[PDB]
Amino acid sequence: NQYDNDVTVWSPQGRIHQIEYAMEAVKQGSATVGLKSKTHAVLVALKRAQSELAAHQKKILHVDNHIGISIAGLTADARLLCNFMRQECLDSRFVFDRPLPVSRLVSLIGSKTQIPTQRYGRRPYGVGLLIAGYDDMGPHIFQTCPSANYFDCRAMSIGARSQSARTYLERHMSEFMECNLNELVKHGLRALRETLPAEQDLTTKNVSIGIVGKDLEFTIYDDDDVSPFLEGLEERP
Amino acid sequence: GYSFSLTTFSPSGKLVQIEYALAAVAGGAPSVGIKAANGVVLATEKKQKSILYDERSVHKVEPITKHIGLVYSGMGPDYRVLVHRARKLAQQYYLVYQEPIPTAQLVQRVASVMQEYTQSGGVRPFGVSLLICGWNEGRPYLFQSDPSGAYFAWKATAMGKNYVNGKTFLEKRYNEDLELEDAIHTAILTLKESFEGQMTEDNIEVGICNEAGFRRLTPTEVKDYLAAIA
Amino acid sequence: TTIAGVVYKDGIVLGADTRATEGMVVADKNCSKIHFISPNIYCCGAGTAADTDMTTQLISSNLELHSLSTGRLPRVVTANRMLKQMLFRYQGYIGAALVLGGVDVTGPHLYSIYPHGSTDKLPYVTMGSGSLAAMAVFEDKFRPDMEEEEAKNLVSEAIAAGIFNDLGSGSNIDLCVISKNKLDFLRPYTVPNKKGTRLGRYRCEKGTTAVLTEKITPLEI
Amino acid sequence: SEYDRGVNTFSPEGRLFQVEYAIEAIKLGSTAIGIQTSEGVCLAVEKRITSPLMEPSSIEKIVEIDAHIGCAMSGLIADAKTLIDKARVETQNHWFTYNETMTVESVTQAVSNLALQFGEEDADPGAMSRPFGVALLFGGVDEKGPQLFHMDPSGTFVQCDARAIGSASEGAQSSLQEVYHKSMTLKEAIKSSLIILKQVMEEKLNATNIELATVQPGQNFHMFTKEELEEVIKDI
Amino acid sequence: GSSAGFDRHITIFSPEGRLYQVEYAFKAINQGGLTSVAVRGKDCAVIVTQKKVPDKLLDSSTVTHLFKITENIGCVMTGMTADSRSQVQRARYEAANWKYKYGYEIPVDMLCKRIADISQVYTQNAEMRPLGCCMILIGIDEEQGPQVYKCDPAGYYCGFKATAAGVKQTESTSFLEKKVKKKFDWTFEQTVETAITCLSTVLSIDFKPSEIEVGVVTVENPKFRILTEAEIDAHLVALAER
Amino acid sequence: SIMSYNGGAVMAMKGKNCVAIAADRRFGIQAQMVTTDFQKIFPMGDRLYIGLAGLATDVQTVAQRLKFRLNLYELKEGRQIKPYTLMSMVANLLYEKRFGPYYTEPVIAGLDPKTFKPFICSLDLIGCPMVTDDFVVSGTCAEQMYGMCESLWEPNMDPDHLFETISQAMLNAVDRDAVSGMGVIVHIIEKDKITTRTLKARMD
Amino acid sequence: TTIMAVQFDGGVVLGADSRTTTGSYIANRVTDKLTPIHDRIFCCRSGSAADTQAVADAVTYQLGFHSIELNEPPLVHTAASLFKEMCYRYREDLMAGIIIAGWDPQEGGQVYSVPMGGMMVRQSFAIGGSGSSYIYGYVDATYREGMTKEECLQFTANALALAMERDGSSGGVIRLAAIAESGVERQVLLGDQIPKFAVATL
Amino acid sequence: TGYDLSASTFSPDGRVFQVEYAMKAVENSSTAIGIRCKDGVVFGVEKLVLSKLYEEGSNKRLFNVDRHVGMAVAGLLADARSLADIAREEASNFRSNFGYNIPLKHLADRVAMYVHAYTLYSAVRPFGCSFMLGSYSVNDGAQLYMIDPSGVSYGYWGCAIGKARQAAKTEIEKLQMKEMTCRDIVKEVAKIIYIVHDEVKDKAFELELSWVGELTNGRHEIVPKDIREEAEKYAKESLK
Ligand SMILES: *C(=O)[C@]1([C@@H](O)[C@@H]2C=CCCC2)NC(=O)[C@@H]2CCO[C@@]21C
Ligand SMILES: *C(=O)[C@]1([C@@H](O)[C@@H]2C=CCCC2)NC(=O)[C@@H]2CCO[C@@]21C
């Protein structure tokens, strides 16, 4: 095919095949869920690595006291974007002495990601992002796609077999707004459990949690810290 | 821009883009140049397609300096580019050495410019060949510069359509003791050898170099010469 | 230096002196301060000699390029624009003071151009160290629409006033008459000063100078 | 043809072609093994000696990044020299600015940032044209204890307990699965790694065709000499 | 009509010395379906163009191919609309810069030469394509009179007594050739009549004032003028009463 | 003055079908003499010479750059340079350094390579050419040389009388300047020979 | 130098002296310090002759291009803004005090002052130059609202003559321009046309 | 043959196929509509909701380019956002240089030139978006321009971009919009949007409305919620 090797080539159908191929990278990756109540925002990540000796790869990253991100796809691209976001927040604090609003950060990310899709010899960013944040307008969950399109979500799952998680979330989304923190985290954990093959279960090893809220800096609960949340979770159907 | 050459070597050792540029030159309007004892004559055919064309607008015979003149065969826009380059080069030489530039020096500099386009990135050669006339040190000079960047010194030569027949005609009719008027007659005869229709003062263009300098003949003078020829 | 210019009924008269000094010593006695720009435009230069020379040569080359491109006779306003933009670019570090005179399709034009890029379009102008002495003659005797001989006499008188009253001006008087039909470049036009005759012969005879070494090299013809 | 695709082209499956091909280059190299214990980190590699005329002492598959960090390399060994120089410069700049030692994770991250910095256009002169064909094992001791990290050409770095890289990785990894427990002593780790290396090597393991290094708390980076190597080899 | 290599895809030579991309750019002018005629007279220059508004939802003011380059130079563009606008912007910049640098208004022939020089670069450099537009310029020169110049995507520029551009260029050229051979030094009315008659005859359309655009320049009023609908209707009723 | 740091005097004079160029020989740092055989006249052709006065470092620099340019010109053109063309070349070289000037002033003396017509010219610090039919001088003792040359020069002198005139002028002028002297060298350029002479001078 | 501009209902009146000085010598005695920037927009230049000429030429170029692209007559405020941008950007390098006066269909007749430093202020009348100092009290005492074109011309001529009497850097002839919708009218006052004021004698 | 792989290549018949493929990208998008009356401009977008997990206000297709200028886009949303930033920068620069609010025709010309610069080279790809600019001022009146991926900008009385453009144009031609008020136009815009929507293929959608006119003091803004809900009621009634 002569239309599928460059990002500057339109197909006769009106598509760019390189961007779709880059979205495939996000579809292959491990699954993550994000949800928000009226006060908090939660990111639940399914950590995994190649072998048991190999510690589960890091999926939830700290960007700022009010912003954290979850990753799906190419990890080096994710670190590039993470460094860009950290620098933007730092510049906002240096110049205006205030935190950067989350929506403006997602706008800056979208601007950064669109440029490579229009120039010869460049490639998209093969990374899908889930952003959890808190600012003056409340808690926010944002989704970022390799096509440079971004979405403001009530809840969202990305990764492999994440359609089942999205189905679960759609069924239960009316409850989330009125939940407390443990209930919200348990909802996210149930959605994430929906992606595992029927034999696998949720352990303290393969689960990472990230929480932000009105009076809590972004916290990453991994290992023993997640045992309080995994407690009281009924078995799968 | 493109950083790579579009002219490369073929297995037989040829630079085929230069040969295709020469093919473009061989399809152009005929040009003739003759070196007399007291001057040089450059003559070309400008046969417009319609009466709607205003003949005083564009000229194929151009002055470069007071004593240097140019004519071409091939593609006109490229000719304009080369004319601008040549005029700038002559002005730079005058600014440095306070002397009008010798014809050979101008030919060498312009040929360097033409060579650059056979090796630079992202460009094609010039599809034009040039005849250059000058008067230096009480002596007339006539030169030819081709798309490759090579220059030759001629007593008489022809370019463009039917240039081989013009060359044979000039071989049979050229003489060392020619004076400029005889040379002008001979050049018009060479152009007549390959002309379709009636030659008038508006479908040919003549220029001459002598001790006074280079000048383009007015249509009246060409009509006088054409009446003499006929 | 004394340079001057007037407009008369049919054109332009420019005038200059021929002395060049290095400090308070006379270096050249036959300098030409009237420079060629185009067959219809000429310039008189004052200030730093090298700056004047190079600036006028550069603008003349640029105008020849322009005239070859357009096929038309150059215009004095084009020279004016080129010169003043170039001089403004250098913030007065090119020390050229110029009198620019030409005749084009719009008529006779005369300009005064200052080293910082300031231009004045006037019917008579003077520049140099002897400018005020020439301007006195102009302000006393100038009339609009003079004949060629009256204008020549007036410019000659102004240059002579600069010569005899300024220490930086002297020697001969050079003139340039520009009309639409002709150009007259008159070097020299008048000679007001000559060198007195010598009264002694300073014994010039062979063998007066003592030599230590000598080498003769033959050259081939 | 080779130049139909650019170097920054995705596959229909969502993978960068050049990275996949470099990972395939990783499979052609020598076998390196790294084991992490509470007493320190052990790194063992095989020298692939092709001729008896080659002097084995000029084969450096294990290098010292700093007194607390060492590296084992597999694949295209010439490519690894740039990364190692970057790592050394990073550790020394960190000491200069902060008057302390770098953590193994930070060094690994700094080296992994260079991995995907390749392209043709929109890149500065002196930029890379292709990926790196090396896999790296970093072993060190910091305030978190003994740390072992793995890096592949994709830029991905992970923390591992035991890990094999190179041509015989799959079988060696299975053996490491069988023999690794959290309560191992460094002597046991050294012996187990040498047993596995002997199993996978096509030659016979003697004291000149392998390399072993350790990093322990309190003791610096140590490359085993031939005599200590013979002492360990006697038990196997 | 042979080929070898990428000679049909980039601006390089074919075995016969041709540039196929320039010929394809000429084909691009006919995409648009419009025709323009320019005629020169004793003291006047006239450009007449076809105006088509397919939508009643279009604002008819903004659909125009007559443009003003300076106060005294006018143009009609034929071909791809965006390319045409790009060339108009380039021409305006060049004329303004000429006035700034040399101190007098740019001649029409020099402006056409500059535009054609810019177009030549696109036929020599391989990373850009030519523009699919033709430009016709009219003006008054205070030494030569009315001026009508045309430039094409190849880099050719010329001055004309009368010319046409667009889909029906050949038929219009024939009509104008016959008219110019029987020479009458044309008055302003005769020039406008000739242009409008050529367009009508070649298109086989009886025009309504809204179907054409007329732009004039005269020695008495040297400023480029666009004719209103009333003036066009006056000319059309005079043409019909013939 | 930075010109007077090393001293030096050069002079050129015009005859009938001949030219003469003379220079002093001292090299010194201010008041101290270092050598007495410093070259200030360089050949730019068989019948063309250039003399440089001023700062000795710039003298050597300008001579070497000028030879660079002249050699390239003569290779490209296949001809020998005319004296006026060399004047223009030197003026261009000096004006390229307008705001970082070379501290040298040149004189050029030669015969036209075809018609064998005398040519002398002088250039100042930045390159304003001065062409004369009598004589040109340059250096720290310019006023002294001007007086001697104005008093002694006559038109249409044969080579011997030209030698006597220029020798007397240079000797008597440098005898009144402290940082110039320690010998004089003269070149007489004719159609068929070059004659180089060293003069008996004061060494104080 | 003395430059002045006064606004009346439906237009403006500008006026200037005609002296150029290089120290105490008058280089030009009939100079024109009023420059047409556009058809109905003029500037009065004060300060460095070269600097003001260069700035005026650049603004004329930019404004002509802008007017061609927009197909509208330009606004006086736009010309004042271009002058302000150039004078503020190069304020360390330029000595230029400008007055911009004009008429546009939207706002009528307008007068803007751009002093040295590059600030821009709209005034009902503006005065500038070295001689402007001597007529500040006179313009404050004599200015009244609702003047006609003829009264504005008389007022400007009186002020300029008073300034030229007391300033050694001002003098020559008086140049006046009236700008309205119908166009521009220019006048020269010389000799006995210049208003005279009796000198005190004992 | 590969006559359609670069924007610097003509086809033998004189077409640049890459720009045509970008236009195909625009034709797949949902429909945006703009209607102009003597006192203002109204913009309406059919915004498809691809999941119920998305918030209200996600993927806005209506932008504020200047305080007096609004933008309605169709096609690739990332390209549209980059173009919106280009237009904002153009307006800011115009205010900083010339000192007043940019005229809409000038802004449209500048943005159209920027878009055209991407249709000439092999090094860049054409934009896959089309958009409408709308403005009001007292001097200039009410202006509505449309720009397509080739760089053509035209002024309109009513314009439609996207998948159902022809049917929407048919509906817009039934209005005597010159003698209508902005209040009536909002209801008519909503009605047309509800008419052209295909419930079978496209599941659910929001109505995005905005306007600029003397009613808003020449400020572009979202239509207030009560007016929007009243118009939606009118539109749903009209569909029976
Ligand atoms: C004249 O201004 C003057 C001359 O050198 C003159 C300058 C320009 C053209 C060449 C000759 N310039 C000077 O520096 C001296 C001082 C006074 O007048 C000079 C002779
Ligand atoms: C006026 O300010 C003045 C004028 O020379 C100058 C002339 C041209 C137009 C701008 C103004 N500038 C000056 O430097 C002198 C000194 C005081 O006033 C001047 C005459």
Task: Count the neighbouring beta carbons within 10 Å of the beta carbon of residue D2.
Answer: 4
Q: Where are the beta strands (DSSP E) in E118-226?
A: 133-141, 145-151, 157-159, 162-166, 212-218, 225-226
Q: Which residues pair with A127 in a beta bridge?
A: A73
Do the Cβ atoms of E100 and G71 come within 8 Å? no
Residue position matching structure tokens 């009368």: E162
Q: Are the Cβ atoms of E30 and H14 closer than 8 angstroms?
A: yes
Is-contact G3 G24, C-beta < 8 A? Answer: no
Contacting B with CB below 8 Å, chain E residues are 4, 10-18, 109, 113, 116-117, 119-120, 123-127, 149, 154-163, 173, 176-177, 180-181
Give the integer Cα–Cα distance in Å for E189 and B130: 46
What CATH number labels A1-234?
3.60.20.10
Alpha-carbon distances of A174 from A154, B11, D135, rounded to whole Å:
10, 75, 48
C1 tagged catalytic: yes
CB of G40 sitting under 6 A from ligand 2: no
Q: Is C1 in the pocket of ligand 1 (CB under 6 A)?
A: yes
Domain spans in chain A, listed from the N-terminal domain onward? 1-234
Chain-chain contact of F196 with C215 (C-beta, under 8 angstroms): yes
Domain spans of chain D?
4-236
The answer to whether B122 contacts E123, with C-beta atoms less than 8 Å apart, is: no
Instruction: Verify A-E touch: 3 or more CB pairs within 8 A.
Output: no
Report which protein residue has its CA nearest ligand 1's atom 4. C20
Options 3.60.20.10, 3.40.30.10, 3.30.450.40, 3.40.50.920; which CATH number does C1-220 get? 3.60.20.10
B166: its two tokens: 């013009």
- H33-65 exposure pattern, b = at least 16 Cβ within 10 A, e = fewer: bbbbbebbbbbbbbbebebebbeeebbebbbbb
Q: Please indicate if any CB of chain C lies within 8 Å of the CB of B66.
A: no
Distance (Å, whole) CA B126 – CA B109:
15
Domain boundaries B1-230, corresponding CATH code? 3.60.20.10
State phi, psi for C62 to the nearest 5 degrees. -65, -40
Strands F9-14 and F135-139: antiparallel
| Rounded alpha-carbon distances, angstroms, from residue A99 to A67, C9, E197 | 10, 78, 72
Answer whether A131's CB lies under 8 Å from A142's CB.
Answer: yes
In this structure, are residues F147 and F169 in contact, taking their beta carbons and an 8 Å threshold?
no
d(CA C55, CA C51): 6
Domains in chain F, please, with CATH? 1-204 (3.60.20.10)
Ligand 2 proximity of G169 Cβ (cutoff 6 Å): yes
- Contact present, B and A (at least 3 Cβ pairs less than 8 Å): no
Contacts of B125 in chain E (CB under 8 A): 13
User: Which amino acid, one-letter code, is at E217?
Assistant: V
Distance from CA of F85 to the nearest CA of B (A): 6
> Are the Cβ atoms of C58 and B95 closer than 8 angstroms?
yes
Closest chain H residue to E84 measured between Cα atoms?
H152
Say yes or no for a CB contact (<8 Å) between H98 and G78: yes
Q: How many CB pairs under 8 A join B and C?
A: 14
What's the G25 CA to ligand 2 centre distance in angstroms? 12
CATH superfamily entry for domain D4-236: Aminohydrolase, N-terminal nucleophile (Ntn) domain (3.60.20.10)
Q: How far apart are CA B114 and CA B19, in angstroms?
A: 14
CA angle C46, C52, C58 (to 5 degrees): 150
C57 at interface of B, judged by CB pairs closer than 8 A: yes
Whether the CB-CB separation of G73 and C136 falls below 8 Å is answered with no
Task: Give the bridge partners for B133, in sequence order.
Answer: B69, B142
Chain centroid to Cα A221, Å, comes to 16
* CB H65, CB H84: distance < 8 Å: yes
Q: Which residue of C has its CA nearest to G29?
A: C122
| CB-based contact, E125 to chain H, within 8 Å | no
Selection from C109, C82, C84 nearest residue C96 by Cα: C84
Per CB-CB distance under 8 Å, the chain G contacts of E68 are: 68, 71
Burial class of E100 by CB neighbour count within 10 A (0 to 12, 13 to 18, 19+): middle
Q: Does B136 touch chain F (CB under 8 A)?
A: no
Pick from E11, E155, E160: which is nearest to B52 by CB?
A: E160
Residue F172 in 3-state DSSP?
helix
Backbone angles phi, psi at F69, to 5 degrees: -65, -40
For residue G45 and ligand 2, the question of a CB distance below 6 A is answered with yes
Nearest-CA distance from G82 to chain C in Å?
20
Helix (H, G, I), strand (E, B) or coil at B165: helix
Question: How close is the nearest chain A Cα to the Cα of H83, in Å?
Answer: 11
In angstroms, what separates the C-alpha of C124 from chain E's closest C-alpha? 22
SS3 track for chain C: CEEEEEEECCEEEEEEECCEEECCEEEECCCCCEEEEECCEEEEEEECHHHHHHHHHHHHHHHHHHHHHHCCCCCHHHHHHHHHHHHHHCCCCCCEEEEEEEEECCEEEEEEECCCCCEEECCEEEEECCHHHHHHHHHHHCCCCCCHHHHHHHHHHHHHHHHHHCCCCCCCEEEEEEECCCEEEEEEEECCCCCCCCCCCCCCCCCCCCEEEEEEEECCC
Q: Which domains does chain G have, with CATH numbers?
A: 1-202 (3.60.20.10)
Using the atom order of ligand 2, give the atom closest to the CA of residue G27: 5
**N- to C-terminal Cα separation, chain F:** 23
Asked if the Cβ–Cβ distance from A10 to H126 is below 8 Å, we say yes
- Provide the H-helix boundaries in D99-144: 104-112
Tokens standing for G197? 């004021």
Domain edges within chain B: 1-230
Whether G130 is in the pocket of ligand 2, judged by its Cβ within 6 Å, is yes
Distance C40 CA to ligand 1 centre (A): 25
Determine phi and psi for D177, rounding to 5 degrees.
-55, -45
Q: In whole angstroms, give the CA distance from residue G4 to residue G134.
A: 13
End-to-end CA distance of chain G: 31
Q: Which pair of structure tokens corresponds to residue E26?
A: 């000429």
The Cα H128–Cα H20 span in angstroms is 10
Sign, CA dihedral E39-E41-E45-E49, equals: negative
Fold of H1-240: Glutamine Phosphoribosylpyrophosphate, subunit 1, domain 1 (3.60.20)
Token representation of residue B85: 């380059």
Q: Does domain E1-242 have CATH number 3.60.21.10?
A: no
Give contacts of G 93-122 with E, CB under 8 A.
none
> After which residues does chain E have a break in its backbone, defined as C to next N over 2.5 Å?
none
Chain F environment of B101 (Cβ under 8 Å): none
Q: How far apart are CA F124 and CA E198, in angstroms?
A: 71
Q: What is the DSSP string of E49-116?
A: EE-----TTB-TTT---EEESSSS-EEEEEE-HHHHHHHHHHHHHHHHHHHHHHSSPPPHHHHHHHHH
Q: Which two three-digit tokens encode residue B190? A: 């060479």
The identity of residue A63, as a single letter, is: V
* Residues in Cβ contact with E25 at an 8 Å cutoff, skipping those fewer than 6 apart: E129, E130, E131, E132, E153, E154, H10, H14
| Rg of chain D (C-alpha set) | 18
CA distance F83 to chain B (A): 11
- Give the resolution to one decimal, in Å: 2.5
Q: Which of G3, G4, G18, G20 has most ligand 2 atoms within 8 Å of its beta carbon, as the pocket-test mutant?
A: G20
For this PDB entry, the determination method is: cryo-EM
Q: Is the CB of C128 under 6 A from ligand 1?
A: yes
Q: How far is the CA of G120 from the centre of ligand 2 (A)?
A: 21
What letters, b where the CB count within 10 A reaches 16 and e where it falls short, cover A185-213? bbbbbbbbbbbbeeeeebeeebbbbbbbb
User: What would you report as the CA-atom Rg of chain H, rounded to the nearest whole angstrom?
Assistant: 18
Please give the single-letter amino acid code of residue B5. S
Ligand 1 centre distance from Cα of residue C17 (Å): 10
Write phi, then psi, for B110 (nearest 5 degrees).
Answer: -65, -35
Domain ranges of chain C: 1-220
Taking a C-beta distance cutoff of 8 angstroms, is the pair A37, A59 a contact?
A: no
Strand partners, H69: H66, H135
